[PDB]
């Protein structure tokens, strides 16, 4: 295929993709304040809802979420 792998159903999703993949791995807090956000439950919907889908994939060690492969 010659288009792009993952799929994004919003902004947020499509940010936590894209900020993970020029940083690299980084915690839920550290996300939600790079999308405007306060707190790591408010990224952690869409964080979970990306792992649910093959695109995410949290660390029980640190809840470093890095993008899934």
Same mark, same amino acid.
């Given at each position: 295929?010659?288009?792009?792998? =993952?799929?994004?159903?919003?902004?947020?999703?499509?940010?936590? /993709?894209?900020?993970?993949?020029?940083?690299? =791995?980084?915690?839920?807090?550290?996300?939600?304040?790079?999308?405007?956000?306060?707190?790591?439950? !408010?990224?952690?919907? !869409?964080? /979970?809802?990306?792992?649910?889908?093959?695109?995410?994939?949290? !660390?029980?060690?640190?809840?470093?979420?890095?993008? /899934?492969?």
């Amino acid at each position: 295929s010659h288009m792009a792998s =993952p799929q994004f159903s919003q902004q947020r999703e499509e940010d936590i /993709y894209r900020f993970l993949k020029d940083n690299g =791995p980084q915690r839920a807090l550290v996300i939600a304040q790079a999308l405007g956000m306060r707190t790591a439950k !408010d990224v952690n919907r !869409d964080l /979970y809802r990306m792992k649910s889908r093959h695109l995410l994939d949290m !660390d029980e060690q640190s809840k470093a979420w890095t993008i /899934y492969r």
